Every structure is written in C-alpha cells, then in structure tokens.
DNA sequence: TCTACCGATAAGCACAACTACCTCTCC
RNA sequence: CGAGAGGUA
DNA sequence: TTGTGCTTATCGGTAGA
C-alpha cells in the first residue's frame, strides 16, 4: 500500500524463497532503506548514528 | 535554521570517538595539555573548550541538509 | 573465551566448540537492544568486523559481479570498485545465482 | 592492481538469462566424464587454483561454471504463466474457428500444470472439460473427433504415455509452436521477462560453497526432453533457501541475522558486594589471555577497560550494561554487585553471563557514553 | 596534442599532520604531490609533472579507517596524448641486430623493427651498426623524427611503448 | 596547448622553486624530473608572446582543426611538398593555396633567429 | 596419527587397557584422574530443592 | 511449557517497530520511504532531546518485557491469562469474521 | 432462452510452533 | 560433517 | 496438534440480454 518495496526484510521475516522468487519475477528494486538490510550488508542503520556526517573542513 | 540548536548524545559520542581516533594517530592538540595522557580526556577538554574545528552536517528527511559547527552548538 | 580461532568451513564464522577455542553467539535480541541503545559502531563491529570481513568487486559500466578483478561481459575495464560486505552476503548471492536469480549492484562511489 | 572503494546501494533483482550465465561463468566445462574440479573448487585435492593465485581458502572465491545443452527449454518458473496464457487463447485460431463456436461439437479445453499426479513431471497438460464432455455424451457423442488434436505438431520427443485420448502432455517444442502467431503485445503483458524464457544452460555450484550427483546426471547429453525439466526443477530445489536443519529461514537466522564474534568470554557469575555498581570483576587468569587492541599490537586486559555484559535472553535494552574491568585474585568466575542483578533479571544459582570486548577506539568511546550504567539510571519502560 | 585537461582526484590525508589552520595549504599541496607521485602511471591519458593551477577544492570527507580524510580537489595539468598522425622526434640510445632502441625521453621506450625503414644492410665491420646504405648516418645523440604508431601498455608497469616507422619523408637527422 | 616555449618556461619556474626549501618531509620522485630535463632539450623558441601569436594567427584567418595545427607545429616543416606527404588528411584539397602556406613558413623561419 | 589433548584436557595417567575383538581391531583406553577441589563457582544442592552456587 | 508465544510475539513486534525513528524536524518518521507515522511525539515531559532516538525499538522492548513478565501469571483459558489477553489485543488483523 | 461472472463452502496443501549453551553416542 | 537423547540458565 | 492463509473448485445463484 505504501509503495515501498523491501524484498530482503520480507524474506528475513518468513518464507525467503517465495519472497525472492516473487521479487525476481516482478523485477523490483531494493534501496536498502531498512535497518536490518543495511546491517546484513555492512552498513549503518541510520537512526542513532549514521544520519549525520562529520566534515573536518 | 529549523534546528533545535542542541548537540545530541549520539553526535557528541561520534565527535568524541573521531577526535580520540585522530589523537591516537599522533595528531597535535589545539588545547594545551597539562597532566593528561588519555585521548578521551583530551577530547573532553577540547569539546568543553569549544576549540575543536569540526563541522556537523545534519541530514533532513526531505533530502536537504544543514551544516553546523561545534562552537555554534551548546553542550550540557 | 576466544581471541582468535578456526572458522567454520561453510561460513567464515567462529566455531561453537568450547574445547578448541569457543565462540559466543550474537543473537537477534542483543542486536535489537543495541539498536534501541543507538550504538552503531559496536553493532557494525559485531556483525562485519569481528564476525566475517570479506570483499566483493562490482563493475561500474554494467551491473554484474566480477571475479585482479575481470569482467567478461564487457572489455577489460579500468573502472572496477571494491565493496566491503560480509561473507554471508556473498554466500546468499551465490545461492541466489545457483537457484536462478541474478542481482544487480550499483555503487555510489 | 589497486581498485577504489565505494559504497553499495540499490540492490536489484532479476531472473537469470542465458547472456549473464554465459558471461559470468569462467572456464565452463560441459563434459559428462570431466568434473573440472581444478578451476572452480577451492577444497579440491590440487596444488593451487588455475584461475587465481595460491591461497588457503581465504583469498580465492568460488568460481562458477555453467553446463551447455544442445537446444532450448522454457524456464520452469514461467510455466504457470504460459499455462494461463494458453487457456485464454484458443490453440487453433490465435485470437482472443472450430474451437471457438459451440455448434461444431468441439468441447472447451483447459491448460494446467500437473504436479506428481500422472508422470511425476511438472509440465503442461491439456484436459478436456468434463462438464462439456458430459453434455456431448447426452447427445450420443461418446468419443472425441479424431481431428480434435490436429493443432499439436508432431514431436519426436513424444513417447509411450497412453494416459487418455482426452488428456495429452505438451512437449517443450510444441509450446513454441503454439506461441508462434500470437501478437507480441499480448505475450509481453502476460509474461514480462520475455528474454529469460530460453533456458539453455544451468550453473553448477562451486566446491567451496558445497547436489553434485544430480549436477553430474544433468550434464550427460540425452533425449527425453520431458525429463530434463524435471531434473532441473529437482536440482533447483536442493538450494538452502528452499524449505524441507540449516535450510530456509533457519539458514537466514544462522548466517545473516545471528552471527558469532571474536574477543568474547562466558563464565559463571557470583556475588561480591565489595565491588562498585559500575564495575565487573574479571579473574586475572582469563583477563591475561584476553587481548585488546590499543593504539601505540595486542595488550592484555587491565583495569579501566569497558566490556559489554549481557545475560541471555535479552528481553529489554537494559540487559546490555557497560562495566569497567576490575582484576580480582579469583579464577574461573566473575563477580558483580548483587544490586545490579535487577536489570539482568538473573539470580546466582548457575546463571552465566557472556560479555563482549570492543576493539576499535570509537566503539569504546560510544560504549560508556550510551550503554554505561550511569546513562541507564532512568528506566525507559515506566520512567522510574 | 598537449591539451591541459583538468582531472579531479580523491587524495586522502593521514591524521598525523592536521593543524596550522593559517597555513594548512602546505599540507594540502604536499598531499596531492604524493598522490600522483605514488601512481606515476597512466593507461591512455599520458603523464603529469606539476600541478600548475589548482581550480577548486571540496569538503573533506572522513572515514573510520585508521584516521584518514579524503580531499576532493579538481585541477588542470600538462599531459601528452600520442595521437596517430604526428611527427615526433627522438634520440637513439644504442643499436643492436634487432629492435633498434629509440628514446623520446625517459618517459617511454620506443622500439624499431626491421620492416620500418627502407632497404638497408647491416654493417658488422665496426663497433656500432650503421645504415649508411641510403646516404644517411645514424648514431647516438642525433635527433631523428618519425611517425608515431599505435601505443601499447602493460598490466603492472603500463609503459607507453609503441612502434617507430621511418616510412615518411625527411627521414634521418636534420 | 604548450608545444615548445611555454612548456619550457613553466619548467624554469619549477627549477626556480626547487632551489628554495629543497628539504621535504615526504618522499620524492626522480623519474618525473628526468622526464622533463631529457625531453625539453629537443626544440626551443626565443620569445613566448610573439611566437604564440604568429602560430595562432593562421588558426583564425584559415580553417585548421586543433589536432592538425598541433602536429604541424611540432614537426615544423620547411617546404610545401613535405607537409603534403606527412599528413594524409591534407591530400586532395583546394581550400588553401600553397603560396600563403609558403609565406607562413617564411614567417616561422623569420621569428627563429 | 597420534591423538593430542585439547585445551581443557588434563590429569594424571591411572591405567592403560588394551583389548581387541574377534575381527582383530585393537582398542586402547587411557584414563586420566584429577582431584576436583570445591571452586568458588561450584553448584551445590540440598534434599528439598535448595540449589545454589558458592559465593565466598 | 508455554514460552514460544512471548518470543514469537516479541519477534513479530520488533520486525514492525524497529524501523521507527524521530527526525530532526520533530516528526516521527519511518525508515521505508520516510513514511510519516506521528507528527509529534506525546512527551508528557517535553524536556528531552529525542531528535535521533529509536522510539519504536524501545516501545517494542517494553512490550516484550511486559509479555515475558506475564509468564509468572497463570496461562489459562478457563480462568484468566494476561499473556493470552495481550496477544489477542496485539493481534487484530488476524481476527476477521 | 442460456449463459457470465459472483458467492458460499469443503478441501487439500502448505509453514509454524522462543533464546544462549553443555553433554553423550552412531554416522 | 551431520543426526538422535539428556541437562543448564 | 492446532492456527492462519492460499489456492482450487464446486455446486449453486442471480440477473440479463
Ligand atoms: Mg533463583
Ligand atoms: Mg537462576
Ligand atoms: Zn563490466
Ligand atoms: Zn579461483
């Protein structure tokens, strides 16, 4: 309903094979917006630490 | 603008960690050191003396961002 | 207690054998509690740095996976970037490729 | 031999086709009698990898190889879409005609996929609607017309089935014949991935990723195209993601969700009111072997260091408490203030606490600023 | 084809020297100086020696990797593209029976094959080989112009090796 | 856009700045300096402003591309039959008469004493 | 080859027993003994469901 | 005897509430598409800095603590069961028709 | 006068039934 | 390497 | 041993032209 695809989190929830097959058939694009998706690919979640950048100069 | 003008705990911790990492890599300290040997103590002194030259860029949900400074923000 | 020890043959993770070196499982509940606390550097170290650190090469002109790295889809390209992902991600990508799913990876830098 | 470093984002999903399969495979071998376990398998009994440098199963990844067939086979994932499309379009008119008018005596036919009920093959079978057949029987028509199945071209791959004159199985070659003449716009709407329909190759998992007998069975060149699809479907279901212990959701939990880390310890905890609330008693025997990383390269654990203590299960965020390490003359046991047992919800009767030792300086800095005991003085559940 | 084409870089700076805000440009210039000195190679661009004009510098992004901060800086420099159809001069270094050496500076090594010059015969009666059959004496130190051919490159060294041909007019020293 | 003259002048500035504060805390490269010293001694000019203006003057009044003008300045031909034999792109054309080209070569020889 | 003791294997050799079956497969058994003095974290129980670990 | 229900409830609630955070604008956003959930946090005591806190995660942790502590209560369909009542309250979409 | 979708109800089939550990004993 | 039974929080 | 979905599918079951 929200038009926000997230195959990785849905697969991690339950039934990963069916979710992956549906995502491949639909050809959806996952932007890794979720925190668990970022953690599974070595990225910061972005809630407490990760939503700001420290620039020296 | 449109900012609370307060430095959060997460930003403070990240700044302290970055400064401690820089100090541990043989970096000169802007603030004078007297009887201090731990990088965390030096970072705390620099943060309390608001003389650390770091800039904070806060990302907004709409896509835009606002750039601040350590001296511009206040601590508590 | 464990400092350094053997890794599991399937996934590059510490073995659950106290006799050899031991290994403590960092479960989902601890990760959720750490997210609630807001410590991201600790969570990044417990899942990628000290758990399984691997590398992956992705072509930039196309969206494929390159094995120095070489891309057989196109000519020998001088623009190939390296991303740092856990070995679990590579294992999942290999599993998806084996079952008949091809993934496209895009790099911002 | 240097490459830049970049971030990863916007992961895409698509079904594998022939182009990507034939372009990603390096030194693919389709010889039935040759396993070719020298350029794609790391744990193979050989000296080094022929496609990369010598390593100890830590610098060489798992190279892929795809076997090559001699013809084209429709992807099993699209069989349902093809069966649905064939049901709507009449197989003798190629429109949205003897099969279109009810006055010609030709009963309506339905296309469906049979699963292990008739010949243990997931194929497309044409079945005559029994309701229409019963109406014809009331009119004296006991058998179907001999030219009822004239729309199916003769195929040499057909064999002895003898199921029934009303039910016939469609070979892979006959499906393409039925698809010929159909408008491209109609076919594209039913099946989006038109390019991935042709499956002429199948990748083989490397020895490093560990399924081999079935792969060696499908590499042999032989006829009976109705069996190749079944073999491909059977070998695809042997993936770890498919449900049947390390399979399906359990595989995800054990690999990506739950992980094991280094620089950790687990011992039994007892009571010691002499220590402070924010201090944890670590024995000298264990702390001496536990090594930490400090910038001057591994020094032993000592006083002042912070460890992340936790008691399973972590039912709330207060189970993670950062405490300062204090060396005690005891051994094989840890001690803490008995008042601090409330956040852990644990007694002293055999309860074991496992802790985590940060290595990077930034993780240590953020550990005692957010996860320390003095920062958790206010309970977040009720404010008390 | 020595067009000064600008090229940005992503040179990183160690945290060992991060001070002197009034004269921090000294650390910036020495950081980019060691950036292209460590590489000192190219595939199809050429070579660079000095960062004459610094166009613009960007915001320094940091990373949690041993205290390193990058610096996106774009500037223009001197280069040279070996385009086909150019008469370039060169100085001979030595002579042998095959693969005559020709150096257009120490930036590249150019080899001359047998099927590049006109009909000549080897002279083994002296120490250095001579090609004075067509009334032209070539020795070490004399500048000889020739037509540049397609250039090749290696994997590690990536040297700008090419082929030298004297098929054009005005051959020999001038 | 440096052929011989302004490429040599910028190297003089490098030599002028090298004598001052030669001690460097970081590493140095001797290959790059060797490439500049052993390549700039091929052909030199007298004056920068007058030479560049006389080279770019035919580029304005006559139609020559940037690539063709760069390769003819490095070769520095002294006749009309030499240029017609070097560049194959200048063969079979009538856009420019050879007599103005001969005058251009005279100007090039005049500026070089 | 030989069998080596692991990280948590120690004791004093008590007896060595050698035996074989009718198939000719030889067997070897080595017993290691050690006195377990009550440590600080040992668990003790009562006759009425009172279980707890040593504290001090 | 009855301990899988609190764990399943906690996992399914965490999978819903872990992506909720508060932004710098004062609104409570979501990780997927910056979806807006609440315009303003309640904050009966508004002297706080919650511009970067994970409110959903701590709410899920509190509800999990409430569910696990209910195990001491009698889990009975005949008399009463606070854990089962909480599970039924938290599960509304399933109960249809 | 003879269907074309729509609805109620078996039915057969799936996924799922908590965490972190330690042991023995066949393979 | 897995599988089967017991136990600890 | 149940708890929810999920897809057939299977008979009617109404209008409806
Ligand atoms: Mg108790
Ligand atoms: Mg207890
Ligand atoms: Zn490519
Ligand atoms: Zn290899």
UniProtKB/Swiss-Prot annotation, chain B:
It comes from the Eukaryota. GO terms for biological process: DNA-templated transcription. Its main location: nucleus. GO terms for molecular function: DNA binding; DNA-directed RNA polymerase activity. Keywords: DNA-directed RNA polymerase, Nucleus, Transcription. One of its GO terms (cellular component) is RNA polymerase II, core complex. It is found in: Nucleus. The keyword rRNA processing does not apply. The keyword Transcription applies. Component of the RNA polymerase II, IV and V complexes. Interacts with NRPD1. DNA-dependent RNA polymerase catalyzes the transcription of DNA into RNA using the four ribonucleoside triphosphates as substrates. Component of RNA polymerase II which synthesizes mRNA precursors and many functional non-coding RNAs. Pol II is the central component of the basal RNA polymerase II transcription machinery. It is composed of mobile elements that move relative to each other. Belongs to the archaeal Rpo6/eukaryotic RPB6 RNA polymerase subunit family. This is DNA-directed RNA polymerases II, IV and V subunit 6A. The chain holds residues 59 to 134 of 144 of the full protein.
UniProtKB/Swiss-Prot annotation, chain D:
It is found in: Nucleus. Zn(2+) 2 binds at residues 90, 93, 100. Disruption phenotype: Blocked in the perpetuation of CNN, CG and CNG methylation in repeated endogenous DNA accompanied by a reduction in long 24-26 nt siRNAs. Transient loss of post-transcriptional gene silencing (PTGS) in young leaves. Reduction of heterochromatin association into chromocenters, coincident with losses in cytosine methylation at pericentromeric 5S gene clusters and AtSN1 retroelements. Altered cell-to-cell movement of siRNAs beyond the vasculature. Release of transposon silencing. Not impaired RNA-directed DNA methylation-dependent (RdDM) silencing. Zn(2+) 1 binds at residues 49, 52, 60, 63. Mostly expressed in flowers, and, to a lower extent, in leaves. Mg(2+) binds at residues 347, 349, 351. It comes from the Eukaryota. Component of the RNA polymerase IV complex. Interacts with NRPD2, NRPD3, NRPD3B, NRPD4, NRPD5, NRPD5B, NRPD6A, NRPD7, NRPD7B, NRPD9A, NRPD9B, NRPD10, NRPD11, NRPD12, RDR2, RDM4, CLSY1, CLSY2, CLSY3, CLSY4 and SHH1. This is DNA-directed RNA polymerase IV subunit 1. The chain holds residues 8 to 484 of 1453 of the full protein.
Swiss-Prot record, chain F:
One of its GO terms (molecular function) is nucleotide binding. Its main location: nucleus. GO terms for cellular component: nucleus; RNA polymerase IV complex; RNA polymerase V complex. GO terms for biological process: DNA-templated transcription initiation; regulatory ncRNA-mediated post-transcriptional gene silencing. Keywords: Nucleus. Component of the RNA polymerase IV and V complexes. Interacts with NRPD1 and NRPE1. DNA-dependent RNA polymerase catalyzes the transcription of DNA into RNA using the four ribonucleoside triphosphates as substrates. Component of RNA polymerases IV and V which mediate short-interfering RNAs (siRNA) accumulation and subsequent RNA-directed DNA methylation-dependent (RdDM) transcriptional gene silencing (TGS) of endogenous repeated sequences, including transposable elements. Required for the de novo DNA methylation directed by the RdDM pathway. Belongs to the eukaryotic RPB4 RNA polymerase subunit family. This is DNA-directed RNA polymerases IV and V subunit 4. It comes from Arabidopsis thaliana (Mouse-ear cress).
Swiss-Prot record, chain G:
Mostly expressed in seedlings, flowers and roots, present ubiquitously, except in sperm cells. Disruption phenotype: Blocked in the perpetuation of CNN, CG and CNG methylation in repeated endogenous DNA. Reduction of heterochromatin association and methylation into chromocenters, coincident with decondensation and losses in cytosine methylation at pericentromeric major repeats such as 5S gene clusters and AtSN1 retroelements during interphase, independently of siRNA accumulation. Altered cell-to-cell movement of siRNA beyond the vasculature. Reduced 35S promoter homology-dependent transcriptional gene silencing (TGS) in transgenic plants. It comes from the Eukaryota. It is found in: Nucleus. Transmembrane segments: none annotated. Component of the RNA polymerase IV and V complexes. Interacts with SSH1, NRPD1 and NRPE1. Belongs to the RNA polymerase beta chain family. This is DNA-directed RNA polymerases IV and V subunit 2. It comes from Arabidopsis thaliana. The lineage of its organism: Eukaryota, Viridiplantae, Streptophyta, Embryophyta, Tracheophyta. The chain holds residues 871 to 926 of 1172 of the full protein.
């Amino acid at each position: 309903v929200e038009s926000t695809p997230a195959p990785f989190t849905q697969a991690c929830f339950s039934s990963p094979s069916q979710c992956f097959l549906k995502a491949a058939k639909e050809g959806v694009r996952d932007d890794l917006q979720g925190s668990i998706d970022a953690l599974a690919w070595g990225k910061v979640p972005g809630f407490g630490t990760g939503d700001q950048f420290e620039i020296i100069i | 603008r449109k900012t609370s003008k307060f430095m959060t705990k997460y930003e403070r911790a990240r700044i302290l960690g970055t400064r401690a990492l820089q100090i541990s890599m043989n970096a000169p300290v802007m603030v004078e050191l007297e009887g201090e040997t731990d990088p965390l103590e030096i970072a705390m002194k620099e943060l309390r003396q608001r003389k650390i030259p770091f800039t904070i860029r806060r990302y907004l949900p709409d896509g835009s961002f606002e750039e601040w400074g350590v001296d511009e923000l206040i601590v508590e | 207690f464990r400092n350094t020890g053997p890794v599991h043959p399937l996934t590059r993770q510490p073995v659950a054998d106290r006799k050899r070196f031991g290994g403590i499982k960092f479960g989902e509940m601890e990760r959720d509690c750490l997210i609630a606390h807001g410590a991201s550097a600790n969570l990044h170290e417990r899942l990628f740095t000290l758990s399984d650190s691997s590398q992956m090469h992705i072509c930039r002109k196309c969206k494929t996976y390159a094995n120095g790295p070489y891309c057989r889809v196109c000519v020998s390209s001088d623009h190939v970037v390296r991303v740092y992902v856990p070995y679990g991600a590579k294992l999942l990508c290999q599993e998806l490729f084996s079952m008949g799913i091809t993934l496209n990876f895009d790099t911002k830098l | 031999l240097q490459v830049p470093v970049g971030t990863l984002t916007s992961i895409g999903f698509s079904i594998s086709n022939n182009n990507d399969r034939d372009k990603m495979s390096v030194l693919e071998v389709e010889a039935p009698n040759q396993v070719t376990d020298s350029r794609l398998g790391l744990p193979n009994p050989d000296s080094v990898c022929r496609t990369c440098g010598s390593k100890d199963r830590k610098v060489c990844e798992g190279h892929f190889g795809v076997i090559n067939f001699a013809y084209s086979i429709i992807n099993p994932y699209f069989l349902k879409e093809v069966a649905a499309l064939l049901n709507k379009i009449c197989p003798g008119c190629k429109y949205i005609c003897r099969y279109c008018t009810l006055n010609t005596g030709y009963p309506l036919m339905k296309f469906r996929v049979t699963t292990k009920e008739v010949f243990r093959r997931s194929g497309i079978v044409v079945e005559v609607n029994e309701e229409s057949l019963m109406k014809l029987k009331k009119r004296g028509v006991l058998t179907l017309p001999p030219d009822y199945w004239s729309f199916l071209p003769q195929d040499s791959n057909i064999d002895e089935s003898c199921l029934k004159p009303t039910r016939r199985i469609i070979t892979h070659a006959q499906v393409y014949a039925l698809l010929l003449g159909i408008d491209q716009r109609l076919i594209k709407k039913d099946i989006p991935m038109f390019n991935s329909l042709g499956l002429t190759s199948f990748p083989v998992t490397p020895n490093g990723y560990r399924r081999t007998r079935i792969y060696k069975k499908l590499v042999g060149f032989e006829g009976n195209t109705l069996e190749l699809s079944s073999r491909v479907m059977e070998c695809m279901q042997y993936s770890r993601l498919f449900s049947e212990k390390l399979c399906g959701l359990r595989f995800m939990k054990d690999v990506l969700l739950g992980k094991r880390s280094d620089h950790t310890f687990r011992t039994v905890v007892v009571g010691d009111p002499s220590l402070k609330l924010n201090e944890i008693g670590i024995p000298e025997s264990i702390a001496k072997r536990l090594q930490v990383s400090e910038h001057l390269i591994f020094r032993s654990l000592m006083d002042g260091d912070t460890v992340l203590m936790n008691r399973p299960p972590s039912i709330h965020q207060h189970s993670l408490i950062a405490m300062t390490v204090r060396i005690l003359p005891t051994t094989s046991v840890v001690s803490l203030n008995p008042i601090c047992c409330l956040p852990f919800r644990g007694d002293f009767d055999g309860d074991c606490l496992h802790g985590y030792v940060p290595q990077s300086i930034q993780a240590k800095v953020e550990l005692d600023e957010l996860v320390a005991l003095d920062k958790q003085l206010i309970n977040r559940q009720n404010g008390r | 084809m020595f067009i000064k084409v600008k090229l940005p870089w992503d040179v990183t700076i160690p945290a060992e020297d991060m001070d002197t805000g009034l004269m921090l440009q000294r650390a910036i210039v020495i950081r980019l100086l060691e950036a292209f000195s460590k590489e000192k190679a190219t595939k199809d661009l050429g070579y660079l020696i000095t960062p004459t004009i610094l166009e613009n510098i960007g915001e320094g992004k940091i990373k949690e990797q041993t205290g390193e901060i990058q610096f996106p800086v774009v500037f223009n420099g001197i280069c040279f593209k070996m385009f086909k159809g150019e008469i370039v001069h060169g100085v001979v270094h030595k002579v042998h029976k095959t693969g005559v050496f020709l150096k257009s500076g120490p930036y590249e090594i150019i080899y001359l094959s047998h099927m590049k010059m006109p009909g000549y015969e080897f002279i083994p009666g002296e120490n250095p080989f001579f090609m004075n059959q067509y009334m032209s004496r070539i020795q070490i130190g004399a500048r000889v112009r020739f037509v540049v051919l397609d250039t090749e490159w290696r994997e590690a060294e990536k040297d700008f090796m090419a082929l030298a041909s004297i098929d054009g007019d005005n051959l020999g020293p001038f | 856009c440096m052929m011989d003259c302004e490429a040599f002048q910028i190297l003089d500035g490098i030599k002028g700045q090298l004598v001052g504060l030669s001690e460097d805390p970081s590493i140095k490269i001797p290959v790059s300096y060797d490439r500049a010293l052993a390549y700039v001694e091929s052909c030199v000019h007298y004056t920068n402003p007058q030479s560049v203006r006389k080279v770019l003057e035919p580029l304005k009044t006559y139609g020559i591309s940037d690539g063709e003008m760069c390769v003819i300045a490095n070769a520095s031909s002294e006749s009309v039959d030499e240029v017609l034999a070097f560049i194959p792109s200048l063969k079979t054309k009538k856009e420019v008469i050879n007599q103005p080209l001969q005058d251009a070569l005279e100007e090039l020889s005049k500026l070089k004493k | 080859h030989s069998i080596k003791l692991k990280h948590t294997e120690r004791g004093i050799v008590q007896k060595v027993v050698l035996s074989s079956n009718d198939e000719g497969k030889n067997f070897a058994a080595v017993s290691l003994r050690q006195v377990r003095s009550p440590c600080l974290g040992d668990k003790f129980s009562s006759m009425h469901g009172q279980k707890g670990v040593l504290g001090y | 005897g009855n301990a899988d229900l609190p764990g399943t409830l906690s996992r399914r609630l965490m999978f819903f509430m872990r992506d909720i955070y508060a932004a710098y604008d004062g609104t409570v956003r979501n990780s997927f598409g910056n979806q807006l959930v609440q315009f303003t946090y309640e904050t009966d005591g508004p002297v706080e800095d919650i511009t970067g806190e994970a409110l959903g995660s701590l709410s899920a942790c509190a509800l999990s603590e409430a569910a696990y502590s209910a195990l001491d209560q009698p889990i009975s369909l005949l008399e009463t069961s606070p854990l089962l009542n909480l599970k039924n309250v938290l599960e509304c979409g399933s109960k249809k028709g």
